[PDB]
Design an enzyme around this catalytic site. Structure first.
Site, PDB file in Angstrom:
ATOM      1  N   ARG A 121     -32.073   3.288  25.858  1.00  0.00           N
ATOM      2  CA  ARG A 121     -32.185   3.182  27.341  1.00  0.00           C
ATOM      3  C   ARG A 121     -31.209   2.121  27.869  1.00  0.00           C
ATOM      4  NH1 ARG A 121     -38.229   4.939  29.522  1.00  0.00           N
ATOM      5  NH2 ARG A 121     -39.055   5.689  27.523  1.00  0.00           N
ATOM      6  N   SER A 160     -30.918  18.234  18.797  1.00  0.00           N
ATOM      7  CA  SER A 160     -31.999  17.616  17.983  1.00  0.00           C
ATOM      8  C   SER A 160     -33.315  17.654  18.769  1.00  0.00           C
ATOM      9  CB  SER A 160     -31.637  16.211  17.584  1.00  0.00           C
ATOM     10  OG  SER A 160     -31.696  15.348  18.712  1.00  0.00           O
ATOM     11  N   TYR A 173     -29.954  17.579  26.641  1.00  0.00           N
ATOM     12  CA  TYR A 173     -28.560  18.095  26.749  1.00  0.00           C
ATOM     13  C   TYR A 173     -28.333  18.907  28.037  1.00  0.00           C
ATOM     14  CZ  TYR A 173     -26.917  15.664  22.666  1.00  0.00           C
ATOM     15  OH  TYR A 173     -26.468  14.659  21.854  1.00  0.00           O
ATOM     16  N   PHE A 214     -23.678  22.655  12.904  1.00  0.00           N
ATOM     17  CA  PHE A 214     -22.666  21.571  12.832  1.00  0.00           C
ATOM     18  C   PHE A 214     -23.218  20.368  13.606  1.00  0.00           C
ATOM     19  CE2 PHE A 214     -21.504  24.219  16.449  1.00  0.00           C
ATOM     20  CZ  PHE A 214     -21.259  23.302  17.444  1.00  0.00           C
TER      21      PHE A 214
HETATM   22  N1  LIG Z   1     -26.404  19.535  10.783  1.00  0.00           N
HETATM   23  C1  LIG Z   1     -26.146  19.775   9.578  1.00  0.00           C
HETATM   24  N2  LIG Z   1     -27.187  20.141   8.645  1.00  0.00           N
HETATM   25  N3  LIG Z   1     -24.796  19.688   9.079  1.00  0.00           N
HETATM   26  C2  LIG Z   1     -23.743  19.319   9.996  1.00  0.00           C
HETATM   27  C3  LIG Z   1     -23.041  18.099   9.443  1.00  0.00           C
HETATM   28  C4  LIG Z   1     -22.213  17.475  10.545  1.00  0.00           C
HETATM   29  C5  LIG Z   1     -21.901  16.043  10.166  1.00  0.00           C
HETATM   30  O1  LIG Z   1     -22.728  15.389   9.644  1.00  0.00           O
HETATM   31  C6  LIG Z   1     -20.542  15.424  10.422  1.00  0.00           C
HETATM   32  C7  LIG Z   1     -20.233  14.260   9.735  1.00  0.00           C
HETATM   33  C8  LIG Z   1     -19.008  13.659   9.931  1.00  0.00           C
HETATM   34  C9  LIG Z   1     -18.112  14.246  10.815  1.00  0.00           C
HETATM   35  F1  LIG Z   1     -16.914  13.647  11.005  1.00  0.00           F
HETATM   36  C10 LIG Z   1     -18.414  15.406  11.507  1.00  0.00           C
HETATM   37  C11 LIG Z   1     -19.647  16.007  11.311  1.00  0.00           C
END
Ligand SMILES: N=C(N)NCCCC(=O)c1ccc(F)cc1
Ligand SMILES: N=C(N)NCCCC(=O)c1ccc(F)cc1
Ligand SMILES: N=C(N)NCCCC(=O)c1ccc(F)cc1
Ligand SMILES: N=C(N)NCCCC(=O)c1ccc(F)cc1
Ligand SMILES: N=C(N)NCCCC(=O)c1ccc(F)cc1
Ligand SMILES: [Cl-]
Ligand SMILES: [Cl-]
Ligand SMILES: [Cl-]
Ligand SMILES: [Cl-]
Ligand SMILES: [Cl-]
Lengths: 392, 392, 392, 392, 392
Positions: B86, B114, B119, B392
């Site tokens: 916050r 999440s 969002y 992602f």
């Molecule tokens: N949400 C999931 N189970 N996997 C997605 C992994 C994404 C992630 O951690 C990441 C980590 C570093 C970076 F530079 C970009 C992305």
């Protein structure tokens, strides 16, 4: 094992079979009321003489796309004694009722299925989809854009405002595909289930708006859950106002409702995810009795050009189908079929609940034209989303 | 509290924040691989100096209706330290990344959320829907009409057939709205998660067809459940054949998959109800960065006449929108708006996952023309159903 | 069955018994470190020759009311082989260790009990109380009056800030009844449990303030629960600031901590009820070895007048007890006893965790003077609430 | 929306709101009995005309430390219709009742809170603590020192021994802080809840001693659990004897009771841990209406010297407070305040359930004198532990 | 505390003790019916004057191996008030009833045990074994060899076919070891438990064959489970036919029955494993009152040669035992004992439910002859498997 219309003396034997067959059996008082919706010769029984088999249809009025109301044979009270399984008694009873329904001039039959595996083979396809949404109402905040940013909604006793529920429901069922006329005996029955039962269900309450109502009760065992048994809203304002009131039940953690996949509730909240889909199942099943009569009776999407094809229904006829200006003309032909499907598949398309391209993907619906598929998808779609009225 | 692009020295501090912020954190080895998809100046950090805030975007290729591939900024690794809540650090970081994404020439941004409540206020709307189907495979019988009434499917080790999975996935992602290009680093990562972990996940197996694959593993704790992590099928034959093989895992009670609402699996079975929907949630979220560029880039339904309107996006521009022959022209105007919506709402319509008439019902989308609503619904719909590629 | 001090050759046999006796056995590496706190002749074993019985004490420093530190014999690693139960081996081993502890000049012994029924009969009484509080952090709002209405708290790796934790803990243990000196071997052990275990516990994180820390980790199986293993705060500001940070773990539903009944956390929130007490149990148990030495060593409430009585401990001596100006004088006498109790009862009163009038109500403590009861209650009470340091 | 005293015609509307608001609603028969304890003008309703808001107070007699009985306004039946939330109806109703309670000459108001977050802002603080103890009675052995080492306890039908329960309860409530007079209508109600309900609660049984009783019943669903609804004991002998009888219910695995943190039951057993604390919650909440009247009415600990201070209550007055010889004198002053607190905090201290030094630690209670804190702690403490009488 | 036969005035006091002692107490109406099976002086009570102790026996007829019916004293309604435990009231009451039973000329006593630990010390041994089988009826296919490859079974209301159940049960109990005569009062009681209870048990249904019946009901809470309360079949055909009907309850997932270890149901199915054993417990307990009378009364296996031995029962007599031609002669002797056992052990062997070699293995039965052990095992075995009639 003979197949007959039941006399007055057969009904105690039928009630015994019902009690042993259906865990939700409504009992002989309620059964005798529902019976008033069964026409002369609407029921069959198999005797051995005790009742070892029964089935019947009720006279219903079903709203289809374009706000068209069809006479509908509503199958119910179908049972084979545990002592007479795998003896072809169901096949026999279903065949005689379909003969009677057809000869009486019903364009469609409908039922609610106890198992999803029994009814496809008799030409019934699932035509509406039930969504359970459970809202964790402690986190529920309405969106800035939500209507109703004095309250027009009243908390009331259901039995003191019967006329208002009747009037609202009557408006609702006439403009919604899946809508059924609710006759007076079923309002008698609905408002008797509203009283508390010692050791059973808790008292039902009502939220009443000029253009909608919700009947709800607290669950027997989970005292932090309110079950909305029925929400009928004829305007978006009514729908939102009723949901403002339900989220206001501060003694509850959760509100649950059985609704349709296109319920706009998730979009009324700042967090769409709070309205979790906890359960999904087939609602109403349709058997198209008369293909040309049914296809010609419903309205089609105005948002697709005039197009013609030849539809074959497996052992159900071949038809020249022309759709334009949201009307269809469906006439006999022996011209080569462009689209093939079993009867049940037609039932599933009929109210817009399932896409032709999805049934094609599973090969329940064969065509060699992608363009015909997209046209069927668009034409058979309903602008008003298909809902389920009440279980029978 | 300053906002900067991270140097090489900032990444250990970012990995600490990640570990404490994300329970599914993939760890620094995998994180360093995913990092190769982040362009120069694709990341921001807030220092106090330890890292108390971070966010970044990845260069993605997103398939949209009409098999059009868009450059897409994929937001990820977004975190504020529990010590700095916050304090407006998210608002600050999201504003700087959106500036950078816009100036770089991305027509759309996307993320996986999440919480469903964070969002919407930054212009992201849920654009794809995740369906979990659980099949009780002991009762699963295929329909007479199901394709594949020798088996073309092979049980294989994932790491021994990488090229075949790459080739099939590449075909899949190019023809499916929601499809993402999977670069080589993510195939490296995917096939490392295929090996068994001591005290963790069990070994992954593959079912390989010429036109599809399924990767699956038995659940850690429920040893009668197979989890299908990924099923890519480019033909109906491939889809059915793979499901024949999965129903053939006789040591399992249940097969579960995360799929899309239009998965045809229920229609391949004699009992549609065996494929229970056990879970439903928002998948990919879209922020339309450039309204005219995005609206002009995607294809529209050919099965709707040419029509024109004026679209206002709340603090996002007003546009003359003309749709015909499955193309759109979107140009500046000051003419009175016929349709109003916030940006997030546009994101939700963009891939065909949500109907305009449903968002109108919740008043997220204002118009005084029912006919314009039906036209938008039909035009924005996708013939190929929208799916979700990978998180992602 | 002889009773001896173990040689170097006996320890593998003792580790076997430990492994089969204690499900939380720390293993031989950690056991060999804890062993450094056992003095020469601090351990006994019973051989049959395999080890069928063992017990030992560690040299501890226990803070008692008035910030007085006592040398304390800490009993641990007590075990009888399942093959040699109900053979009087415990009675024998406890008697020899108590002889050795007494002769060595320890005023008190202490332990953590595996069952609440074993230790009363050897003169041990429960002296501290463990409260588990679970906060549903989604509803947690801080009160207007709560301190800390920049953040002074940092999220850090435990192993990178050992000196700061040592310094804070050292301040904490010196001013809190129940406090134990944590020697260097136990800091070595604590910061090794902070790393993640493959198939075991997740990585530990630290919240560091100038005047407090919290070590926490996410639970193995419940991924929406953070377990605070340890929160040491030397000021109210530090305590509140650390809890602001913990309520800021937005990926968690629940924060749980094992604390004391007088933890002020419930009063920091607008809703006291959010901090639910989910578990309550006896912490540290005391055996007063030397009644006069222990009674004279601790401080008493200044807020009660000078008063004199005669205390009898069952087979433990009779004493003239004079309390005034927060000091006690405790001398031999044969004068008639005004207050009688077993030794364990004295252990339970000693740190202020239990009220004399409560033990009187259960008749564990006999007197014929209500006024003497109120005086004991007030005098034995501690202004700083009694806490539990660490399990041994 | 006007605020009025209800006429006889308003009560059916109030019962409707009650039914929809409270899952434990006692129904209109019982409600009409409890109503006899509401004085003329003790109730308010908000009409829109249906009842959308209600609140009332009952005339109660509350025992406070020093066996002093105070006239007490007992708030109950407080409800806002789900249709009229966040409209300031509670704030309005609470303000009018507090005006009426104050003008009528009540020194204190009290309630039982449905949520722990609603009542702090109107000056109510939690004043008693509820402990659930669950005993696994299969392992329960009494200590050698426990009283009652013929049985004086009888198993009886509650309705056949009303006079004996009345006499024992009357003795209990007069000597216990938290005690309430139970008028005849509430004995009528209590002994009607003692009969078995078809599909509801099982028959209640009584254990009767000359100086105590226990009412208990077997749980509806867990048939190995006995729930002690009420145990009133006026001597330690009575308390122990009743617990000997309860541990003698050999058909039960577990005995559960809602009691107070200082219940001596754990100390009657050879294993204190068998009496597990399974639940902990705020009981009675107090609003001190008249600070000087309340502070002067209760007795204080004789075991603390005479001392003087200046107490400020936030928007509640500033007072010279002198405590000595277990009496207080509380008079107006404009002298600098030494101790500040909101009104709710005073409510929480008033019965001795919470320590001043604990509320100071959370900064609900500001002073710059540690010595004043210890003096307040000691003076406000109660020799007889504070208990909760019955929910209203 | 005196021990007396109860007068008419004692029974309300006995019903109070029953209600507080037995969670399954049948209530005073049913209790007054069961009372008709208690002979003059068949009951004892201990008064203090309220009833603090009671016990009684009923006149029963027990079928033993060789289709021999014995007069049997059936112990029931045994209770000691929770206020009078560990006072030797049970020992006293059991001693007086055994004196009365012995003097009346009963060869055996029997009971159903509330705990398996109370009754061994009074000479009762477990004599029959209860098996719960749960069938997952969705996978249940009958074997080619199963009898009944028209149905002879009818679904009926229990109360309309009392005579047929009586006739079948009467045939069953006369030819089955463990069989009890069911007098008319117990048929009155059984067919009253067949009606549905509001908030209680659901309606009971009957499956009726010429040579067998099953009474079943759906479980209160699990609506996919049918509980078979009673299945009596006098032929293998009847047994199979009834199970064909039960597997035909298509609304159920599971059928459960309490049966005997030798129930042939598993062997009627293509998969023996579908009939899972979910529960196992001691049924009827026997005390042999007169060793020679009982041993001489039952038939023995014809499939073992004539053999002689000397049996000693601990404080029960020494006897020359000669077995041949399925008869035994049992006469006094002072000759050296070849086989020793406590009385309870004899009770456990008497109906063939337990093997002598199994009790020898636990040393409940001492002999130095392996050959004598095998002979006892074979001789005491029953060709008709031992079953349990009904709980008393
Ligand atoms: N949400 C999931 N189970 N996997 C997605 C992994 C994404 C992630 O951690 C990441 C980590 C570093 C970076 F530079 C970009 C992305
Ligand atoms: N399925 C539900 N919960 N209610 C539908 C009740 C239908 C029914 O029992 C019935 C009974 C008798 C008739 F003649 C016709 C229908
Ligand atoms: N109870 C816990 N979780 N840890 C305490 C470990 C104590 C312990 O094992 C030990 C081992 C060897 C010694 F010599 C002394 C003590
Ligand atoms: N909370 C509980 N379980 N019982 C308290 C019942 C209080 C109540 O309903 C009531 C009803 C009407 C009145 F006029 C006053 C009070
Ligand atoms: N155990 C069961 N479920 N039923 C047996 C009921 C036996 C019983 O209560 C009784 C009651 C009174 C008598 F005089 C004799 C027996
Ligand atoms: Cl619906
Ligand atoms: Cl997908
Ligand atoms: Cl602690
Ligand atoms: Cl209490
Ligand atoms: Cl049996």
């Amino acid at each position: 094992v003979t197949l007959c219309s039941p006399t007055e003396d057969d009904w105690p034997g039928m009630f015994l079979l019902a009690a042993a067959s259906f865990t939700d059996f409504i009992g002989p008082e309620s059964a005798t009321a529902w019976r008033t919706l069964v026409p002369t010769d609407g029921a069959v029984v198999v005797r051995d003489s005790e009742v070892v088999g029964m089935a019947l249809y009720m006279d219903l009025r079903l709203t289809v796309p374009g706000e068209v109301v069809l006479p509908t044979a509503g199958l119910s009270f179908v049972a084979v004694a545990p002592t007479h399984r795998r003896r072809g008694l169901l096949r026999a009873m279903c065949a005689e009722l379909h003969r009677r329904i057809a000869d009486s001039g019903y364009p469609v039959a409908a039922l609610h299925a106890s198992e999803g595996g029994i009814y496809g083979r008799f030409g019934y396809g699932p035509a509406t989809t039930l969504h359970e949404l459970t809202v964790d109402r402690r986190f529920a905040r309405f969106h800035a854009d939500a209507p109703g940013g004095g309250s027009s909604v009243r908390l009331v006793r259901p039995t003191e405002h019967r006329g208002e529920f009747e009037a609202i429901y009557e408006r609702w069922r006439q403009q919604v595909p899946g809508g059924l006329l609710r006759p007076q005996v079923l309002w008698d029955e609905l408002l008797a289930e509203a009283k508390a039962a010692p050791g059973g269900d808790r008292e039902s309450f009502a939220l009443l708006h000029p253009d909608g109502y919700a009947l709800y009760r607290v669950d027997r065992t989970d005292l932090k859950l309110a079950r909305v048994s029925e929400l009928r809203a004829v305007t978006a304002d009514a729908h939102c106002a009723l949901w403002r009131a339900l989220i206001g039940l501060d003694s509850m953690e959760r509100i649950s409702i059985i609704t349709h996949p296109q319920d706009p509730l998730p979009h009324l909240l700042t967090d769409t995810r709070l309205a979790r889909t906890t359960w999904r199942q087939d609602g109403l099943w349709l058997r198209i009795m008369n293909v040309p009569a049914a296809l010609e009776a419903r309205g089609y999407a105005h948002e697709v050009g005039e197009f013609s094809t030849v539809l074959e229904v497996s052992d159900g006829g071949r038809f020249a189908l022309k759709i334009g200006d949201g009307r269809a003309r469906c006439t006999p032909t022996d011209a080569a079929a462009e689209i093939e499907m079993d009867r049940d598949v037609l039932g599933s398309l009929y109210l817009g609940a399932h896409r032709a391209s999805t049934l094609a993907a599973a090969n329940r619906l064969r065509t060699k034209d992608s363009q015909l598929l997209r046209r069927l998808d668009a034409a058979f779609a309903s602008d008003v989303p298909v809902q389920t009225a009440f279980e029978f």
